[PDB]
Structure formats: C-alpha cells, structure tokens
Design a protein around this ligand. Structure first.
Ligand SMILES: Nc1ncnc2c1ncn2[C@@H]1O[C@H](COP(=O)(O)OP(=O)(O)NP(=O)(O)O)[C@@H](O)[C@H]1O
Ligand SMILES: Nc1ncnc2c1ncn2[C@@H]1O[C@H](COP(=O)(O)OP(=O)(O)NP(=O)(O)O)[C@@H](O)[C@H]1O
Lengths: 110, 628, 628
C-alpha cells in the first residue's frame, strides 16, 4: 500500500539497502538482474509495505541476500560488475521520497 | 520468554530535549521558523492540485512579533495549520514528525523539500519559553489553542479569540532572563544567521514610531538562495547582488564558480573570489573558513576547517544539500567522512575556477595581485593539486618588462640547451635583478625567475620540477650554465691558475666558509657567497631567523654551508693572486680577503655576525681616504 | 479545555539515539564501561552498610571479552546487577536512569558519584551491535537474560546458564562491518582514550598466547586518577609516575599545580609544565592545547581552545569535575560560560605556578630557556596578566654578563636619575652588545636590556611600562639620557656648530632619511640610523618584511621612518664638516655622505635598498687602494 522507509549505501562489490520496518512480518524479497522488489507487513498494525526498485546497474541474484531483524530488513545486492560506482539506486533520475543514503555506513570506497 | 514493548520516561525525556540537546538557546527561533517554513511548504504543495485550499488566505508568509510588555515572542505563519488530532499527535508526541509522515506519502515527482524530520525541534521553544501557546487553524477543523509549560502535560481547547482563517501562531511566553529575544536587533541577528534563505518572507514587527503604530521590517530575508537555480540562467549581475548580500560587501565579486555534485552526496555550491583580500585574511586565526554549509536552505555550520584547506580561506561561499546527516542539535554534521568528499569537490572546482580565470589575463592580474600568497601556500601544503597550482604561478623575470609571466611562458622562451629553470630569491625586485649571481646568466641571455615574497621560499621548496624542467636556485653551489667545451677548458685553466689563491683565502676565511672556489656564474662582481645545495638559502636563513614561534634548535643545523665563489676574470682577484703568490701571509692580503668576504655576505643577502666590526673597516678606509 | 499527557513515538525516539545523538561509534564502549563503573559503585556502596552484599562475589572488576568466532564483544561486570523489574524498567524505558533514581535516594552526605544520569547511554550499544543480550544477576533475584535488536520490543527470560553469583554481562552481537571493535588495539585505543581513569580494573581477554588459553591484559587502566587525592599527600615521584602515564613522556614534569576549586562551579586540575618544549609546540596548528576535560573520571573533550589561551598550550593537564552540564553526546559542555570560569582559574593558577617556580632559580632557568616564547606571546596576547607575566621575563643585559636577569633586578641596579628601562633589539647578543646605539649608555654606566628573539619585538609593543618605569628602545629618536646641565649646554653648542652639515647631508640623502641630527647616544661610531618613535624599529621592520602570510601594503604603511644621527666628536665627521663648509657640492662630500649612510644602515640593523650599489663602492675603494 505504501513503500517502506529505506536507507542505502555501497561497497566495491555490493549495494546495501536497509528497509526500516520494525517488528516486521511475512518479509518477501525478489532479486532480478535489473530489479529489486521488497514487501512485508509492519509489526505495529500489519500494514503492507511494497518497494519496487528498478536498479541503476546490473546485479547477481545468486550472490545477493537479505537478513530480517526485528529492527530492519537489510538487503545486500551483488554488483554485476565490481568497481561500478552507484550515484543513485535506480535507473530513473526519480527522487523517491522514502529513500535516503545510510550515512552511518556510507564510505567513499572508490 | 516474555516480550515487552520499549517505553519512555516522558518527564526525563523532555528534560533531555530542553537541557542537553542544544548547545546554544538562540536556535529556538530557527526551529520555529523551520516549522513555519514546513507548514507553508505543506499548504503550498496541497494548493497545487486544489486552489480551494487557499480560499482561507492566499499570502504564504512568516511574521515575528516580539511584545516587550507581555514578555512574549509570537511567530505567525499562514501555513497548513493543525487539526485537533494533529496537535494531540504532533505537538503531543515527542519524536513524532508530521513533516516526515507527510513527506513519505508523496510520489517521487513531488518538488517539495521540508526541513523537519526528527519530531523534536518544536520542544526547543522551551529553551526560552516559560509557557508556549500554539494557536492554530487548519482548513478541515476549528481554531484551537494548544498550551503547555512542558510539565509532562498539555491542554487543548476550542479558541474563542481572534479568527485566523488559516495558519498557526506560536506564542512563546519568555522566561524573565530570556527577554533578550524581544530586542529587534537580537531577532535580526538570529534570523540573518540561521534563516536568511528560508523560502518565505519573514517579516518582523518592531515598535510604534516616535506615525506607524507597528513598524514592519518588511522582510528579514530580503534575499533569494540563487544557488538552487541552474547556473546557465543566472547573469553575473545576479551573482554580484547575491555576493554583496551574502557578505555585506559594497564591492562586487572577481570570479564565481556555481556547480552541483551528484552521487551518494548530492550538493550545490557558490564559490566566490572577492575583489580584494580581507585585510586580516591570515591574522584572523578565528575565522578559519568563509564557506557556509546549509541543509534544505537552513544554516548548519561555517567555520569548519574540514570544508576547505587553509590556503582557500579567502573564498566566500555557500554549500547546500538536500540529505546530509544532522546531529540532533542540527548545529553540526554527523558523519566526518562527508566533509572529506565535500572538500575534494570544492577544491577541484576552485582550481577549475582559477584555471578558467587564468584564460582572462587582465582579471588574472587583479586576482594574483592579492591571492598570490594563497596559491603559494597551496603549493606549500596541497601535495595533490601541486601540479595544477604550479600553472597558476606568476613571477617577474629578467626577460619580462615590469610584468609577471607563467612558468609555461618561461618554458616557451627557454634555449634548446637548458634542462633547468633558473630562479633567484631575495628581498626586492631590484636587489635580485642587480645581484652578482645572475651576471653570467644575463650575459648568455638565460632567463631568471625573480622570487621576492617570503612565501616564495616556502613555495619553491615544494616546486622542485615543472614540465620535466628542474627549478635550480642561482644562489646554490655548482650552477650548471649551458657552456661550450672551449668555455669548460677555460674554466679548468682558471681553476688551475687560482688553486693556491683558494687555499690561501680558505686559511684567512677559516670556519667563515666551507670552501673557496673559482666560478662560471660571475662577470663584474669580484666574488659572491653561495650556499651548499642541501640546506637553507641566504633568503630562507633570513626568513627563518624572523619567525617568532619557530624552535631555534632547527636553525643550528638547517643553515647551509657558505661557499665563496671567486670571479677569476676580476682585476681585484688577479691582483689578489699576484699578492697571495708573492706572500701567503701579507697583512694587506689578510685585510683584502676578509673585506671581500663581508662585502660578499651583504651582496648575497646574508646578515653579518657583527655589522660593527665590518663598519669599523669602512670607517678606517674613510679615514685613510680623508687623510685623517 | 481537555488535558493530555505528552507521549513519545518509541520507534522514532530509539532511531534518534542510534542515528543523531552520537557522531562517533567508538563511544559505545565508553557508555557500557560507565554503566559498569556505576553498577560497581552501587554494590560497593551497598556493601559499606552491609558486608553480606558481597558474599555472592567479593571482587569488583570489568572484563572485556572479544569473541571473533561469534562476532560478539562481551562486557562482564561484577556490579550490583538487575532484578527482573530493574531490567524491564531501566533497559526497557528510554530516558529512565536507575543511576539517577539510586543517587537521589541517598542521604546528602553519601561519599559517592556516578557517571550515568540521562537514561539513554545503553542504547549507544546499537551503534555497533545488531543485537544486544544483557545477562544479569542481582543479590535479590534469579539470573535473567534481557535481549533485543532495538526492534521496538525486548524479551526477558530466567536464563539459568552459567551462574554469575552477582553482576551483569552485556553481549554485543556486532554488525558485520563493526568487527573492528574486536581488534585488541582498537579496544586498547578506545578504553585508554575514554575510560583510562575508571575506578575499577578494566581487564581485556583476547586471543591465546602463541601458553595460556587467553591473553589476560590484567588492566587497561593500570594508572589511577591521582588528582582526586589531597594535593598535600602526593609526593613528586607519584606526580611523575602519573605525568609519564598521562603523556608518554620518558622524563618527569618540571613543575605541577594541583588545585581544588569549590563554589557554583567545582573542579580539580593537574597542570604539568613539561621538562622540555614539544618539537612541534607552535608548529602543530591542530593541537590548540594539551588539556583534557573529564566529568566524574570519564573523558569529555580535549584540544578545546576555550580551556586555556594558546600561549599556555604547552601545559599538559587534567581538568575533572563532578558537576558540569554535558551535551547529550557527552562529547562537549552545554555552556561556554563554564569554560570561561574554568579558563580564568586555569590561567590564574598557571601564573601562580610560574611565580612559585621563579623562586627556584635552577628550575626557572630550565623552564624559561624553553617556554620564554610562551611568556612573551602571553604578554602580547593577554592584557589582564601583563603585570604578572612581565615579572616572569628574564633577559641578558649590558651589566649581567651571561646571566639572565629579571626587570626587578634591572630596577634594583637602575641609577638614581633613571626614569626609563633602556632596551635594545637585534639578531644576536654580539650584534646588540657592540651596537652603535649603546655607546654612551655603556660609557655613563647605564644598563641596557638585550632582546634577541623575534618574539621580543612583539612583547615590547605591549610591555610599555614596568614598576612605573617606561621601557625605552635605544634605537628610537629623542633618547634623552640622565645628563648634566653643562653637558646639555655643550650638546646644544655642538648642534649649533653642525646645522650646516646636517642640511648639506639632508640635501644629499633626500627621501633616504626624514632628518639628519647631531646626537649624544654615540661615542666611537661616526653615525647611526635611528627610527621615529611611532614607526617600526630597524628590527621590527626586518621581522615584518619576513612574515610570509601578511599583506605588505597594509603592514608597510608604518615602516621605519629613518633619521641619521651624527657623532659631532668623530674625526670623520669634523673633517666632513670642514669639507662641507668649504664646498656644499664637493663630489668627495657626496661620496662620504652616501657611504656613511649605507654603512650606518648596516651597523643599525637595516637592509640596504640595493646591496650591489653599495658593494661597488667597497670594490672601488679596494681598486684605488691596490692601485688597479
Ligand atoms: N507552525 C506550524 N504549522 C503547522 N504545523 C506545525 C507547526 N509547528 C509544528 N507543526 C507540526 O508539528 C510537527 C512536529 O514538529 P517539530 O517538533 O518541530 O518537529 P519537526 O519539525 O517535524 N522535525 P524537526 O524540526 O527536525 O525536529 C510538525 O511535523 C508539524 O506537523
Ligand atoms: N552493567 C550494568 N549493571 C547494572 N545495572 C546496569 C548496567 N547497565 C545498565 N544498568 C542499568 O540501566 C540503567 C539505564 O542505563 P543507561 O541507558 O545506560 O543510562 P544511564 O547509564 O543510567 N545514564 P547515562 O550513562 O548518562 O546515559 C542504569 O542507570 C542502571 O540502572
């Protein structure tokens, strides 16, 4: 019904995306070469979150993963080409209002 | 296993927000002006799809209304307002932001951007407020007063007072020790510092005239944040009115860089070179930087030495960003690795500005006439950009007619035999240009760079090579001029026939020099004192002997070894040879050789270890000349 | 009217503590070691009135156990522990402090002080931890494990694992990129920075010996907060062991203050003068001072330019207080007023230290031969203290030999007629002592202070008077010595004899000097160059012409206005008068007047306007003398 708040960052080989859903339930994640999809129910009220992220550059579903915690869901995506810089999470120049950079874990690794 | 929700101790949590978050009380006015700017952004955005939202009032603005009689500061805006449920939720719940909960509802095409996100900044009103009343009127509900002294509770009531139509009106009843916020000069200071770029007119209501019943200072922000616009659409007049407004300068800017960075960081900046250097630019150790950092048009910090290197301190500028991490106070940035990435981009775009300015020779003269020290301090301190900065250098030279040339112009004139850039350092353009060291260089027509500020000596130590041409001081031992084999043979004959004189002069000048040598660098001077290569020149030695706060221990070994260079073609030196080879211990040779050494120390730009023992030689010669 | 209690949005409030309170992650270990030192202080205190409180375990220690195999960092603590209700209350409620609630239950005389008070410091664990398990046993309840990811809830259960007897164990399951906090030196750094002075042994259990099954690093805090003891009890060896531990210097402190300040602001301080000035003492523009500020033995901040003025930056020291208002991050204070009242007391007691040290002449020589730059920089900067700091000054003089003497020793030796403290400035004691300016001071037996470092020229701008005696440079115009009326009568007759020579010399020297005058400061020099009273001295010009980062148009506005002073009794000058009286345009008089002006520029400590133009006269006189 509405995207989860998300924070994101990257490393040389990986792109990290923290979906900020506390006491989360029924967490589903789908990785595809050109896209991420995330959905879950929020722990306060069972409100359905859904985020579709048509990705800035290619990724590997076979080396990508997600960890659920009662604090947040962290996705770790494998860059399809290590050393690609990611100036934005999505192929579009869209200003997704729920998405920001994780400046506790952002580093200029390049 | 038992599961529990986290709680909060609201009585002590409010005590944290009031007593511990904010290091200065003045910020209360930027938090309440930010909440008004967000309330105005919410109704502006709601009106775009439905003009009926403004039927209750069209004029989106902020009013500050200090009342010295009631010890009250009122902040009025014609923003979205709050329904009863929005008061009870957003002012009643600590760490709940109605701004975040609105922002996260919007589609990605929304052109709004709002300052609030923590859900705490309203509580900063209690830094200065004894009690706060928030009168409010949304479109979809009645007028209400919300009222609290932060005593763990707040009251809401239907408001029977003056009808607002639409807006909010934060009445701060101030503590008796905090009535300074009612002085119109105080409000002007705080609003100019924190909030001069808020996108809505902040009017201040001041006093009765001696008649205006209530004088408006029409806007406190009678300026626009032009840096949010596209740099192609702004003319140099528009940048000049902004530079004057940002700095309070009467004069224009010299040059401007306006750019954006996009990536993990997204930011915009205006960097201005001022017409003239501040008279205090390096004496004012407190104002380390002239860059202001903003987030969402609200001020964060300025005097952070991590934003630009100390050699760029003259650049007046603004950096602004949509999404940097803020400390809970909002008085600083939370992640120091962000300043490094800002600094990399600011410096790269400053050096773009200076190389784009260097294309325009008449404006580059006006620049370098005042910011030479900054480029040279950049070559002293910035090892990465040293190459880029070396092309910004301008110097007088023996081939340049009271005019300054770049190292690329020196290299354009270099003779095909030169593998080195010849430079001299000293006290004045006349003192270097007349010097003994350049006598054979100018005879060959070899060009020499004149270095004449004290900062040139700190600079040229790092400027070791340019375009693969080694910079060599003409005041250091074994200067290689592009001589012919016939000249090299004449130099070996000259070293041969004067070998004894150099030994005799080194006995007379013992400990006063490392050695005495026959030289290729002179023509008309009988001798000069050069230094060894690995130490301070005569100019670096005088400069370091004048730095008040330098430890004297380094001067005891960095002071280079003096070599006396003889001119073998001089009539004094040929006569001195004929005397020295007649008698090694002639008192008239002892006197001649030490008087030549002391005259060479002065000619070379050293000081004497005792000027009075030297002056007494001249006063004896004057007595003998006067026949006394 | 409807009344509501404030709420908090716990999901957002927990996120502010994890994101926006703390700008460095490393402090999570400070907060958990502070919570352990408070839990140890609680059970230590309860054991004072009832020893049986320790029959469950008599040791009071903190163990840190990194576990790289499981990514956990554990913090074991033989403190009071928590009952099920204390876990559910104090860890479960944000901004609730069981430390503040314990401390406020005590009798007012209770001899205790605890670091905790805000009730948020534990959640700084979630800077580095993905999850925290707190395993604990209190004397009065079962062993429980409390566990949470900070996911808006926590779980509690009767743990019944390995039994603790009484204490707590915070297990931090670290995030996959925060495993740097399992490195032994990372922990050694963080503990020796933040928690070096915690009143309980902090032990680190790492790796294996490669042999014991772990390296039992018995203490990270082998040193003790020595400043909490009475200043009368500590011996100089115990202050020296602490100074070496605090600073890593290999030698003892030179001198120490230990002070106890009591009132509205209460603090203790140790201030140490090093045995030697640091190699980088003024060169390190980042290290503003060597003072560390602590509150309740936990480190708050260092390098704060508000604690002491930059002239005292050499003092290594601790400031500690029970009572200062901390910011929510605990990395700074909430009030700059607190730092001013600290700074006044720090400075006031440093100038006591130097005044006490100045009675021990051999230790005062060891101090002043290194920190005299700091005292003189102090007299330049610090207007309140010049009357104190100028009694710390020591100088060579024309009647002390090689002993350094104070202005009070000068004032003891002053002749009965002296209204002035005469001083001279230059590059070396030998240039200065044999200078032309002191010739009649030294003949009358008047004493002259010798000032030799460039910082001395700044010092005497501000040091205008000492003990009601004006400091007078012997290199400035109008030097009236204490003198007899018959010698004044002869001196005005000497002026009367020489008015024509002075006008002829002023016509020759036009724009090279402001005046030419007969004078009495000379005896055996024929002339010297003296400045106006309100310009730079000959040495102040030399120093300012060598400051790299100073605008030469702005400073050079007040350059040395030069007077030429003639010795009317010199045989050069009486002969020159007889020539100038024979012909005003004699080419011989024009040569000697320029050669005497250029020789007098040298002996008076100026540079020549061109050294080559001068040197050509000396080379000419050599050519003439040799018959060339
Ligand atoms: N002048 C106002 N007009 C309309 N709504 C307001 C006004 N002031 C406060 N509010 C509401 O109060 C909410 C909480 O305010 P506040 O406590 O200031 O935190 P915040 O501004 O949302 N975020 P922050 O400033 O970063 O702490 C806002 O999000 C609005 O919903
Ligand atoms: N290791 C421990 N042993 C016993 N009690 C503890 C321990 N750690 C935390 N507590 C309890 O938990 C309470 C809250 O802890 P905490 O959230 O860290 O805040 P605080 O230490 O009390 N105040 P502050 O350090 O100023 O943030 C403490 O006051 C104690 O009652």
């Amino acid at each position: 019904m509405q995207p989860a708040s998300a924070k994101w960052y990257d490393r040389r080989d990986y792109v990290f995306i923290e979906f900020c859903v506390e006491d989360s339930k029924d967490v589903n994640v789908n990785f595809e070469k050109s896209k991420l999809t995330f959905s879950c129910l929020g722990g306060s009220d069972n409100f359905k979150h859904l985020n579709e992220i048509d990705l800035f550059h290619c990724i590997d579903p076979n080396d990508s993963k997600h960890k659920r915690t009662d604090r947040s869901i962290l996705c770790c995506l494998r860059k399809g080409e290590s050393g690609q810089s990611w100036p934005r999470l999505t192929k579009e120049r869209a200003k997704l209002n729920w998405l920001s950079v994780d400046f506790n874990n952002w580093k200029d690794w390049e | 296993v038992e599961t529990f929700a986290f709680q909060a101790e609201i009585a002590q949590l409010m005590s944290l927000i009031i007593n511990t978050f904010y290091s200065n009380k003045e910020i209360f006015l930027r938090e309440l002006i930010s909440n008004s700017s967000d309330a105005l952004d919410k109704i502006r955005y709601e009106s775009l799809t439905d003009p009926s939202k403004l039927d209750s009032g069209k004029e989106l603005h902020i009013n500050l209304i200090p009342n010295k009689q009631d010890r009250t500061l009122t902040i009025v805006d014609t923003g979205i307002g709050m329904t009863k449920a929005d008061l009870i939720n957003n002012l009643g719940t600590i760490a709940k932001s109605g701004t975040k909960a609105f922002m996260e509802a919007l589609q990605a095409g929304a052109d709004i951007s709002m300052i609030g996100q923590f859900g705490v900044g309203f509580y900063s009103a209690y830094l200065v407020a004894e009690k706060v009343t928030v009168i409010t009127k949304h479109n979809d509900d009645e007028q209400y007063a919300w009222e609290s002294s932060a005593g763990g509770s707040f009251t809401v009531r239907t408001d029977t007072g003056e009808p607002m139509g639409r807006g909010t009106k934060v009445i701060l009843h101030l503590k008796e020790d905090q009535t300074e916020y009612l002085e119109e000069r105080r409000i002007k200071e705080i609003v100019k510092k924190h909030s001069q770029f808020i996108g809505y007119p902040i009017t201040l209501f001041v006093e009765k005239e001696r008649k205006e019943k209530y004088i408006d200072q029409e806007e406190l922000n009678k300026t626009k944040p032009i840096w949010t616009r596209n740099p192609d659409d702004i003319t140099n007049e528009e940048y000049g009115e902004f530079y004057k407004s940002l700095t309070n300068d009467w004069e224009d800017h010299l040059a401007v860089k306006h750019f954006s960075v996009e990536g993990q960081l997204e930011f915009r900046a205006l960097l201005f070179v001022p017409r003239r250097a501040p008279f205090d630019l390096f004496e004012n150790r407190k104002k380390k930087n002239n860059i202001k950092l903003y987030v969402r048009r609200v001020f964060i910090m300025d005097n952070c030495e991590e934003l630009i290197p100390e050699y760029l301190n003259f650049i007046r500028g603004v950096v602004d960003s949509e999404d940097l991490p803020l400390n809970i106070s909002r008085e600083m940035l939370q992640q120091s690795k962000i300043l490094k990435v800002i600094r990399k981009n600011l410096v790269k775009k400053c050096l773009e500005l200076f190389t784009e300015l260097a294309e325009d020779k008449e404006n580059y003269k006006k620049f370098y006439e005042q910011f030479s020290k900054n480029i040279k301090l950049g070559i002293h301190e910035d090892s990465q950009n040293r190459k880029k900065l070396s092309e910004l250098l301008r110097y007088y030279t023996s081939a340049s007619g009271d005019e300054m040339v770049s190292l690329k112009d020196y290299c354009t004139r270099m003779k095909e035999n030169q593998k080195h850039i010849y430079y001299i350092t000293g006290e004045t353009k006349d003192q270097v240009a007349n010097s003994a060291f350049v006598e054979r260089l100018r005879k060959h027509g070899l060009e020499v760079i004149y270095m004449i500020e004290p900062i040139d000596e700190y600079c040229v130590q790092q400027l070791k090579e340019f375009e693969g041409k080694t910079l060599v001081s003409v005041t250091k031992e074994g200067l290689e001029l592009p001589e012919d084999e016939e000249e090299k043979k004449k130099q070996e004959e000259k070293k041969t026939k004067f070998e004894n004189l150099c030994k005799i002069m080194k006995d007379i000048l013992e400990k006063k020099v490392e050695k005495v040598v026959v030289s290729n660098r002179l023509v008309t001077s009988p001798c000069c004192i050069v230094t060894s290569t690995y130490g301070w020149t005569a100019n670096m030695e005088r400069i370091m002997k004048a730095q008040a706060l330098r430890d004297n221990s380094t001067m005891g070994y960095m002071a280079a070894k003096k070599h006396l260079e003889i001119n073998p073609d001089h009539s004094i030196i040929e006569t001195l040879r004929q005397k020295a080879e007649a008698d090694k211990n002639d008192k008239s040779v002892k006197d001649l050789v030490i008087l030549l050494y002391e005259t060479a120390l002065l000619s070379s730009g050293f000081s004497l270890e005792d000027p009075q023992t030297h002056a007494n030689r001249i006063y004896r010669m004057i007595k003998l000349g006067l026949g006394i």
